[PDB]
Amino acid sequence: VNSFSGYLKLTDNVYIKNADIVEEAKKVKPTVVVNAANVYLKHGGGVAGALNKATNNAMQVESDDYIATNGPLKVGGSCVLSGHNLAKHCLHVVGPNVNKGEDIQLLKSAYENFNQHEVLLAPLLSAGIFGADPIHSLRVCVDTVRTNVYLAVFDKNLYDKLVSSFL
Ligand SMILES: O=S1(=O)CC[C@@H]1CNc1ncnc2[nH]c3cc(F)ccc3c12
């Protein structure tokens, strides 16, 4: 039993809710919140900008030190950093950004990072400003993640479309 509330169950292990991931993280305090990161951990907009703003820029400060030490992530890769006031940990995962021409097949590799964590609060990878089709992202999620994932979809119209079209 966990504290996630109001989710629709899609499969054995995948759940979905129309929610603001920032507000959801603030209420649940999950062990892991996933950020929709880029390789430079520059949290300027989308989910990343929202999560970073909610940490009063502490996420960005920590991220800049991470990059200065380790260099950029790979597209499809991830790193674990602090969850600050939102979660115990933040799993920064880099989905391909279609608006940069990155290969969509890397979306499966990106979701594989979730399997290293038993339970996660997450957005749909490569959705929003990353330019992928969220219906496709949900399908890859369901077919790749085996651990327990609670998906927050900010846009109510999109949430209803994802549910109604789910196979
Ligand atoms: O859901 S969508 O709009 C349709 C694709 C987008 C995915 N992005 C998100 N997914 C979940 N929670 C979220 N909270 C946010 C706060 C912001 F300021 C900007 C984006 C988000 C967001």
Side-chain angles (χ1 to χ4, degrees):
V1 179
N2 65 54
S3 159
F4 287 105
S5 175
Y7 286 75
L8 176 66
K9 183 168 176 69
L10 295 174
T11 68
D12 181 64
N13 65 299
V14 178
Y15 293 80
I16 195 166
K17 184 187 184 175
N18 174 215
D20 184 342
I21 192 172
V22 169
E23 279 319 298
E24 190 77 4
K26 280 200 291 191
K27 145 181 135 43
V28 175
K29 284 302 226 83
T31 305
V32 181
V33 66
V34 173
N35 182 32
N38 59 54
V39 296
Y40 306 111
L41 302 179
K42 286 173 60 95
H43 310 302
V47 169
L51 290 170
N52 176 59
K53 178 178 179 186
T55 76
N56 180 45
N57 211 50
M59 178 181 284
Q60 190 65 66
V61 169
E62 179 195 30
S63 292
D64 288 350
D65 170 83
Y66 173 91
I67 296 289
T69 297
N70 300 109
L73 296 181
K74 299 169 181 184
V75 179
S78 71
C79 68
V80 179
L81 291 172
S82 179
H84 300 278
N85 54 317
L86 302 180
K88 186 176 198 297
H89 302 108
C90 179
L91 181 69
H92 295 272
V93 180
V94 184
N97 190 325
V98 176
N99 305 315
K100 302 172 175 179
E102 294 167 351
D103 167 23
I104 194 61
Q105 300 295 137
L106 288 169
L107 187 54
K108 187 172 185 76
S109 302
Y111 274 116
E112 288 170 340
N113 295 286
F114 290 23
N115 290 321
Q116 300 294 318
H117 303 277
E118 287 192 358
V119 184
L120 315 87
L121 172 62
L124 284 170
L125 298 180
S126 297
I129 68 174
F130 281 63
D133 176 6
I135 297 180
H136 175 66
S137 182
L138 178 55
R139 187 79 252 168
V140 178
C141 181
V142 161
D143 293 342
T144 306
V145 181
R146 297 177 301 283
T147 55
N148 290 146
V149 57
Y150 289 84
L151 292 173
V153 177
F154 179 57
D155 190 69
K156 173 57 161 156
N157 188 294
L158 174 59
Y159 169 85
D160 286 347
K161 183 197 191 113
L162 286 166
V163 168
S164 292
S165 61
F166 184 71
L167 227 198

